[PDB]
Design an enzyme around this catalytic site. Structure first.
Site, PDB file in Angstrom:
ATOM      1  N   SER A  30       0.831  -0.953   0.272  1.00 56.10           N
ATOM      2  CA  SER A  30       0.035  -0.037   0.132  1.00 56.10           C
ATOM      3  C   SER A  30       1.280   1.424   0.009  1.00 56.10           C
ATOM      4  CB  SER A  30      -1.130  -0.106   1.318  1.00 56.10           C
ATOM      5  OG  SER A  30      -1.908   0.835   0.879  1.00 56.10           O
TER       6      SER A  30
ATOM      7  N   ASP B  70      -9.980  -3.640  -4.858  1.00 57.23           N
ATOM      8  CA  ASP B  70      -9.378  -4.490  -3.281  1.00 57.23           C
ATOM      9  C   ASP B  70      -9.948  -4.272  -1.998  1.00 57.23           C
ATOM     10  OD1 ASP B  70      -7.917  -2.115  -2.418  1.00 57.23           O
ATOM     11  OD2 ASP B  70      -5.631  -3.251  -2.398  1.00 57.23           O
TER      12      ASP B  70
ATOM     13  N   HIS C   1      -7.012  -5.869  -0.622  1.00 56.89           N
ATOM     14  CA  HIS C   1      -5.595  -5.260  -0.400  1.00 56.89           C
ATOM     15  C   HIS C   1      -5.496  -5.924   1.094  1.00 56.89           C
ATOM     16  CE1 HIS C   1      -4.168  -1.357   0.004  1.00 56.89           C
ATOM     17  NE2 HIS C   1      -4.257  -1.717   1.326  1.00 56.89           N
TER      18      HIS C   1
HETATM   19  O1  LIG Z   1      -7.888   1.253   6.435  1.00 48.96           O
HETATM   20  C1  LIG Z   1      -7.233   0.873   5.323  1.00 48.96           C
HETATM   21  C2  LIG Z   1      -6.979   1.746   4.416  1.00 48.96           C
HETATM   22  C3  LIG Z   1      -5.558   1.654   3.401  1.00 48.96           C
HETATM   23  C4  LIG Z   1      -5.496   2.105   2.558  1.00 48.96           C
HETATM   24  C5  LIG Z   1      -6.408   3.560   2.887  1.00 48.96           C
HETATM   25 CL1  LIG Z   1      -5.921   4.395   0.811  1.00 48.96          CL
HETATM   26  C6  LIG Z   1      -7.627   4.185   3.591  1.00 48.96           C
HETATM   27  C7  LIG Z   1      -8.063   5.276   2.923  1.00 48.96           C
HETATM   28  F1  LIG Z   1      -7.314   6.234   3.137  1.00 48.96           F
HETATM   29  F2  LIG Z   1      -8.622   5.449   2.396  1.00 48.96           F
HETATM   30  F3  LIG Z   1      -8.655   5.733   4.125  1.00 48.96           F
HETATM   31  C8  LIG Z   1      -7.403   2.698   4.202  1.00 48.96           C
HETATM   32  C9  LIG Z   1      -6.040   0.091   6.593  1.00 48.96           C
HETATM   33  C10 LIG Z   1      -6.218  -0.360   7.612  1.00 48.96           C
HETATM   34  N1  LIG Z   1      -7.345  -1.054   7.512  1.00 48.96           N
HETATM   35  C11 LIG Z   1      -8.318  -1.580   8.599  1.00 48.96           C
HETATM   36  C12 LIG Z   1      -7.163  -2.116   9.572  1.00 48.96           C
HETATM   37  C13 LIG Z   1      -6.757  -3.774   9.340  1.00 48.96           C
HETATM   38  C14 LIG Z   1      -6.172  -4.037  10.567  1.00 48.96           C
HETATM   39  C15 LIG Z   1      -4.357  -4.322  10.074  1.00 48.96           C
HETATM   40  C16 LIG Z   1      -3.486  -4.069   8.991  1.00 48.96           C
HETATM   41  C17 LIG Z   1      -2.521  -5.163   9.448  1.00 48.96           C
HETATM   42  C18 LIG Z   1      -1.824  -4.858  10.883  1.00 48.96           C
HETATM   43  F4  LIG Z   1      -0.760  -5.148  10.927  1.00 48.96           F
HETATM   44  C19 LIG Z   1      -2.503  -4.676  11.830  1.00 48.96           C
HETATM   45  C20 LIG Z   1      -4.242  -4.616  11.968  1.00 48.96           C
HETATM   46  C21 LIG Z   1      -6.956  -5.426  11.190  1.00 48.96           C
HETATM   47  C22 LIG Z   1      -7.881  -5.077  12.169  1.00 48.96           C
HETATM   48  C23 LIG Z   1      -8.608  -6.473  13.248  1.00 48.96           C
HETATM   49  C24 LIG Z   1      -7.927  -7.369  12.241  1.00 48.96           C
HETATM   50  F5  LIG Z   1      -8.869  -8.584  13.095  1.00 48.96           F
HETATM   51  C25 LIG Z   1      -7.333  -7.974  11.316  1.00 48.96           C
HETATM   52  C26 LIG Z   1      -7.033  -6.761  10.699  1.00 48.96           C
HETATM   53  C27 LIG Z   1      -7.539  -1.553   5.623  1.00 48.96           C
HETATM   54  C28 LIG Z   1      -7.293  -0.656   5.348  1.00 48.96           C
END
Ligand SMILES: OC1(c2ccc(Cl)c(C(F)(F)F)c2)CCN(CCCC(c2ccc(F)cc2)c2ccc(F)cc2)CC1
Ligand SMILES: OC1(c2ccc(Cl)c(C(F)(F)F)c2)CCN(CCCC(c2ccc(F)cc2)c2ccc(F)cc2)CC1
Ligand SMILES: CCCCCCCCCCC(=O)O
Ligand SMILES: CCCCCCCCCCC(=O)O
Ligand SMILES: CCCCCCCC(=O)O
Ligand SMILES: CCCCCCCC(=O)O
Ligand SMILES: CCCCCCCC(=O)O
Ligand SMILES: CCCCCCC(=O)O
Ligand SMILES: CCCCCC(=O)O
Ligand SMILES: CCCCCC(=O)O
Ligand SMILES: [Ca+2]
Ligand SMILES: [Ca+2]
Ligand SMILES: [Cl-]
Ligand SMILES: [Cl-]
Ligand SMILES: [Cl-]
Ligand SMILES: [Cl-]
Ligand SMILES: [Zn+2]
Ligand SMILES: [Zn+2]
EC number: 3.1.1.3
Lengths: 382, 382
Positions: free
Chosen positions: B113, B304, B346
């Site tokens: 990302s 994604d 993603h």
């Molecule tokens: O929201 C996200 C995003 C990404 C890019 C953009 Cl561009 C944007 C924006 F800007 F549009 F807002 C947002 C970031 C993280 N989001 C949720 C967090 C996942 C979390 C996780 C992931 C990796 C880890 F190492 C640890 C935990 C987790 C939580 C609980 C769990 F049970 C499992 C995983 C998914 C996508």
């Protein structure tokens, strides 16, 4: 005034917390965010209610509670029951949704999962009483709850069950009712009996309520002497194959009650003929689905996540008739088994699987309106 | 000793927390429970590392941090930068994974990302320096970070990006970067700057670290005057279409670097031509997937979960070549776009979707071994 002349009472299963007895953030048992069963049915002018009964207790304890939930009064588990199992005789006291409930004023009962068992046992008590209590009051005198007397008929119009484990579940046998996880459940109950707690998990009759001036160590010590740790008077036991069979062996068909069941499948047949959970099975049932689906007996494999299809169709040694989804479900005295809902897991019936987009609110609204229409039919064919 | 001559540095994206900087219970960023990228690749005798950089910070701030993560030393965001945006010039100090990093000792960079954007900007600084910092140290004297000098070539062998939003995402534009949710993010960072906190969410340069003798009220007051609340020097801005375009406009291809991209799809075309998330898309991306998938411009819809396909293939204004899975990915100076992984959302790229049983550990192990192999190839085709 209400479109239904007999109130409908929805009865939650094991681990079910409803209304004001839920944590601050918690799924709503009856419908999740998909279809708010109580609120929506009421807005459509139906008289409906959601019972609150022990989440972890036995079908016996729950069934007694259900009665007092409807009728009102101080829960009386019965002197003989209390003495046999080692828990308080008297429990919480309920306002009562229908204080005039008596022969002639009927109620419709729909139960999800274990709630279906709880409903059956309550009707048993109404009609046939409780032999051990009758016998104890015969020998020792005193007052006996009318619930345990028998002879109270014409009080329940219908018993309708959703994913109820009428014949138990291997998930209980091989997980839920094992030593180590019973200890966990009981420890949870102990903790949530602490003096800052506002949720009742349903085992306070076993002594899991810390007194306001008691230390936690003294609480632990008092409660380590409770019979709960080794008893079978609890939900985990009652959901086992044996535990459910015992309820089946002591229940009987009421020829005036309209009996109907719904069943879901959410497993699929794999390489060797075993069943595995569908993508879309609410993830918390992943492990239990695999336990069930890998059973030696093939006909015990298909499941909704935690209850095998054989267990949900009907109590195994009670009379049933396979019914169609279109035909009026209006027969008394016999388990009308509705056609299996393909792709519905255990919790899809109550709409709390927010992960599963295949199961939509409009679908769930149809399902519940479905049940109400059947209940309207029952009223109209008296 | 290591099968790879040049160390591999994996760079997490937005909200990424790794190593000692994650909460007590927390997914492992690089592989989840599915494939422990760092541990397993090491066991197979590869030299690999996971960078730790600002989770909420700008690409600029993260890019600087990346440099110091590799090189070692006190983060210096640059005097002109600090002055223009209104944040501390100096940040944390890093031990250094490669203290001798210089032209001729190269490193492989793979970014998930936003990590992909971070990697591009860092390399830009190495090669072409920072004009504002050159100009400011010209005029006002003092010391300048080698990162901002320029003329450092032959330091990064490869840039490989996984689900990187090279052209930004509507999820940022219409959610992430809106006023209300930026406030929420910043409040989170404020809170986690409290004096009992052991996690660094990456915005302490903006003053979000409560001093050991300061009250929380005084902390709130001190930090309400920070420019962070209104700045564009943060991740949310940088992930917008405009924000990403600006990085694209100031970056250029290094003809000695091997560039490769991967992209996932996890949406499906619906009745009217809009895209909706697949069952199996990690649920936290449900709403962002629908925002993206309902875009007016049709070619911006497939996604994604949070990154549209157009955004992940390649920066829109840079050269690329569509590649095959079997084609050695060995061309320098051009974005080698790997074929889309159907059904990878993603987060499937990093293996933390524990809900999705379709995406198994052995698959993810193959993907990561795949990347290492391509990197070995780059080493061997010098
Ligand atoms: O929201 C996200 C995003 C990404 C890019 C953009 Cl561009 C944007 C924006 F800007 F549009 F807002 C947002 C970031 C993280 N989001 C949720 C967090 C996942 C979390 C996780 C992931 C990796 C880890 F190492 C640890 C935990 C987790 C939580 C609980 C769990 F049970 C499992 C995983 C998914 C996508
Ligand atoms: O494990 C269960 C079970 C059922 C029957 C038997 Cl027989 C057995 C046993 F013991 F045999 F193994 C076990 C009990 C409850 N399990 C998880 C609870 C679901 C939960 C939920 C649902 C409705 C609510 F009102 C509130 C919460 C929830 C949590 C988080 C969430 F994001 C959404 C929903 C599912 C089934
Ligand atoms: C300035 C003191 C209040 C900080 C806000 C809440 C932090 C929780 C305390 C953490 C702990 O004692 O483990
Ligand atoms: C962690 C960054 C993205 C989360 C946004 C969606 C969460 C709110 C929706 C409610 C839910 O998660 O079930
Ligand atoms: C089973 C989860 C209980 C909810 C915990 C969070 C409550 C709150 O922060 O208000
Ligand atoms: C809507 C904000 C997320 C937290 C509440 C959901 C947790 C639950 O399912 O109990
Ligand atoms: C919040 C604490 C819960 C207590 C767990 C104890 C389990 C056990 O003694 O088996
Ligand atoms: C973000 C989730 C972390 C919860 C950790 C609580 C605990 O240590 O029990
Ligand atoms: C996916 C949500 C991130 C929460 C991380 C924290 O509270 O430190
Ligand atoms: C316990 C089940 C997951 C919690 C739902 C959420 O994080 O929105
Ligand atoms: Ca489901
Ligand atoms: Ca997925
Ligand atoms: Cl709880
Ligand atoms: Cl009565
Ligand atoms: Cl209580
Ligand atoms: Cl900190
Ligand atoms: Zn009892
Ligand atoms: Zn900055």
């Amino acid at each position: 005034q209400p479109l239904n002349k007999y109130p409908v009472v929805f009865v939650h299963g094991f681990l079910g917390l409803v209304g004001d007895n839920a944590p601050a953030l918690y799924p709503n048992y009856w419908g999740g965010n998909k279809f708010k069963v109580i609120e929506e049915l009421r807005k459509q002018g139906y008289n409906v209610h959601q019972a609150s009964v022990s989440a972890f207790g036995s079908n016996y304890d729950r069934a007694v509670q259900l009665y007092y939930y409807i009728k009102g009064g101080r829960v009386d588990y019965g002197a003989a029951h209390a003495a046999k199992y080692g828990h308080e005789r008297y429990g919480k006291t309920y306002k009562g949704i229908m204080p005039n409930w008596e022969p002639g004023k009927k109620v419709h009962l729909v139960g999800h999962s274990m709630g279906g068992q709880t409903i059956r046992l309550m009707e048993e008590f109404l009609r046939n009483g409780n032999k051990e209590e009758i016998a104890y009051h015969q020998a020792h005198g005193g007052e006996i709850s009318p619930l345990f007397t028998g002879g109270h008929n014409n009080m329940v119009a219908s018993i309708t069950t959703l994913a109820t484990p009428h014949n138990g579940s291997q998930a209980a046998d091989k997980f839920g009712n094992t030593e180590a996880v019973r200890k966990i459940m009981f420890a949870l109950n102990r903790f949530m009996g602490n003096k800052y707690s506002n949720i009742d998990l349903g085992l306070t009759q076993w002594g899991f309520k810390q007194l306001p001036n008691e230390s936690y160590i003294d609480y632990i010590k008092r409660v380590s002497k409770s019979k709960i740790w080794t008893s079978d008077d609890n939900a985990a036991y009652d959901l086992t194959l044996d535990g459910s069979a015992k309820l089946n062996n002591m229940t009987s068909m009421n020829p005036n009650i309209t009996y109907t069941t719904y069943t879901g499948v959410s497993s699929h047949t794999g390489p060797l003929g075993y069943e595995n959970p569908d993508l879309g099975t609410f993830f918390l049932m992943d492990t239990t689905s695999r336990i069930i689906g890998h059973d030696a007996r093939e006909e015990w494999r298909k499941n909704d996540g935690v209850v095998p299809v054989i267990s949900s169709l009907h109590p195994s040694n009670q009379p049933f008739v396979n019914v169609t989804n279109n035909e009026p479900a209006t027969r008394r005295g016999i388990w009308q088994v509705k056609p299996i809902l393909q792709g519905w897991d255990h919790v899809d019936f109550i709409g709390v699987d927010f992960l599963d987009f295949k199961r939509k609110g409009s679908e769930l609204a149809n399902f519940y309106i479905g049940i109400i229409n059947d209940l309207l039919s029952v009223e109209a064919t008296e």
